[PDB]
């Protein structure tokens with residue numbers, strides 16, 4: 001078994017490092033003063049970057065791989081997406097869900113993702129997808145720690161037996177309680193649905209992840225209730241507000257007032273760049289707003305924010321290979337986090353910040369932690385992002401679970417020349 | 424020498440095709456009714472997509488690889504970018520320019536780009552970069568047909584001897600006349616600068632490519648003068664309006680009136696997605712506009728529009744590997760061209776439409792044309808875009824000038840499994 005990772009670069013650190021492994025855990029981390037020789041039982045990072053695993057804080061594995069079935073989302077909006085999904089949800093089968101979820105999970109394993117939070121639509125009396133996903137969770141455990149959010153896609157108060165079905169999903173084992181206040185029939189149902197969500201999370205000791213204000217409506221302010229209830233219950237670390245795209249349209253004075261509460265509450269935020277740039281701004285003609293939440297300001301204020309892929313070939317997104325560096329690339333551009341340091345520090349948005357969002361207790365390159373880490377063939381975060389590098393090796397429990405032999409490009413000039421796009 | 428390309432898929436066509444090569448040209452194209460066997464002198468496309476070469480209609484090779492030298496563009500705006508570039512322009516040397524231009528050109532060759540239009544700043548009495556680029560043009564000719572735009576970065580009427588320097592650049596051999604009306608001191612200088620640009624293009628029989636209305640100013644309407652002068656002179660095919668980002672902010676009534684003229688004029692449009700999403704919207708707080716020109720509407724109206732990378736690690740853009748599929752990916756998202764057919768047809772924005780913009784006379788997979796083509800390991804445009812595939816082979820004059828051995832990804836589950844991200 002592997003005993004050491006050598007010649008590793010670490011974000012924010014100078015030089016090279018050696019990571020000693022023992023019994024599936026990291027036993028010690030020591031700085032090197034030069035390049036170490038390879039040897040049996042040593043995985044050579046070759047001066048590449050070593051980081052804890054990529055994380056997918058927000059994806060829909062029950063809907064993945066279904067775009068165009070039975071119809072396509074023509075308008076490219078959240079609302080038509082839900083209608084198209086409703087048509088597909090009526091055709092679900094146990095095996096159908098497991099096969100599609102596993103297809104995307106394999107792409108995630110290949111992409112160095114070892115932690116995934118999937119929402120599963122529980123606005124369905126049969127709970128077909130949830131039952132299938134609970135089995136997938138057990139099956140994929142050796143490679144990915146999968147969290148399941150009981151997501152009441154059609155509302156808690158606005159769907160028949162919505163609250164009972166949400167609770168049934170928790171009794172069956174869902175890890176996180178979801179909600180979607182802006183989709184409820186009225187603002188009052190939206191606020192009430194959040195009180196019910198928090199009560200269920202406290203009753204069952206579960207996390208919370210709300211699809212919150214995913215709409216270009218400057219009056220959609222459910223995020224303040226999510227943060228206030230979390231603060232009141234002293235449970236911010238266990239709470240996440242996904243999307244908050246309406247915040248892109250708020251006036252600045254209200255946003256400033258709100259930010260004090262967001263920071264005090266300690267709740268987490270997920271932005272989904274690939275899907276948000278596609279679904280938001282659809283009701284504008286020109287100019288057209290970007291529609292991503294206030295990521296730059298959250299980072300400046302010390303509010304935990306991270307990025308999710310959200311959808312992979314489904315009603316809300318026709319593309320994707322479940323690649324977090326690609327999600328990061330889109331977010332940095334749309335949010336204008338284009339300074340050198342902002343880009344270089346971008347990896348935090350798909351690693352550490354996402355681990356905090358999932359309330360992970362065993363994450364990071366530190367002594368005592370499980371030996372879960374990935375190696376990128378790049379010098380730092382900036383380089384990895386610019387070149388959209390693959391994951392050279394993914395290690396879990398001290399064993400290699402995925403590897404990518406890099407592509408080899410040659411140009412035939414006066415003589416052949418290898419091209420690696422580096423400077 | 425290669426005699427045939429077999430098992431090729433072609434955009435918009437059903438089945439497989441064989442492309443016969445003779446004397447460096449395409450002699451004939453014949454449909455296949457099944458998979459053909461490989462043999463010596465036959466390049467097997469392996470049911471991948473064969474298209475004419477990618478094109479880069481807008482890049483700055485004189486500024487490439489200079490980001491942060493001597494200072495960084497902190498605000499991420501066009502205006503500070505020009506100031507930072509001015510500082511770097513004062514430090515230019517002949518060899519400096521040739522080395523950096525060649526570095527990016529090699530990445531382009533590796534990425535299947537055989538046609539490139541580079542702007543070169545001629546607001547410089549020494550014309551240092553232009554002299555260097557004219558040599559690079561000759562040196563890179565076996566691999567890339569490079570067009571040089573004499574670009575008066577600091578204005579024609581607003582810079583000392585600007586008009587004389589612009590004409591001197593044409594007398595030295597620049598292929599295209601540039602302008603930047605929105606950067607001139609006054610609207611009147613902007614309009615007058617365009618009359619001077621057109622007069623020079625007719626005097627020397629050169630093409631025109633104007634950095635046009637690259638500003639979030641709803642009153643920046645220099646595009647109507649570019650189109651009207653082209654229509655008057657009957658030279659639309661030879662004229663290009665780059666950027667036109669102000670069009671993102673125009674009211675709809677004026678835009679509708681304008682579109683009639685744009686179509687009648689026959690001029691070309693270049694949008695630069697990676698740079699536009701970064702530099703535009705910088706004066707908005709929230710909501711923030713996207714700032715790309717009206718690409719979707721141009722396509723619906725039959726107006727020729729295409730995509731450029733614009734900058735590769737320079738004052739206006741800190742990233743890039745000169746990859747056109749990556750430029751296309753950003754443009755489809757920001758412009759909301761996310762329908763299946765829109766994404767699949769996206770390749771036109773980086774191939775045929777760009778060739779028209781460069782007024783190319785020998786481009787396309789057709790009998791009689793030079794055997795210049797590339798092979799993508801994908802089933803169609805949608806697949807190539809979704810998976811961001813590399814260029815498997817680039818063929819020029821019937822010879823392979825670049826090749827990429829694809830990466831190999833494996834996940835170690837109960838048994839090893841190859842992952843190609845396909846469905």
Ligand SMILES: O=C1NC=C(F)[C@H](O)N1
Pocket residue numbers: 060078153180211214275310311316
């Ligand atoms: O409500 C939603 N359902 C599915 C999505 F992909 C989007 O995150 N929002």
Ligand SMILES: O=C1NC=C(F)[C@H](O)N1
Pocket residue numbers: 483501576603634637698733734739
């Ligand atoms: O005026 C400009 N100079 C350089 C750029 F990259 C941008 O295209 N605009």
Ligand SMILES: [Fe+3]
Pocket residue numbers: 058059060119211310
């Ligand atoms: Fe979602």
Ligand SMILES: [Fe+3]
Pocket residue numbers: 481482483542634733
């Ligand atoms: Fe430019």
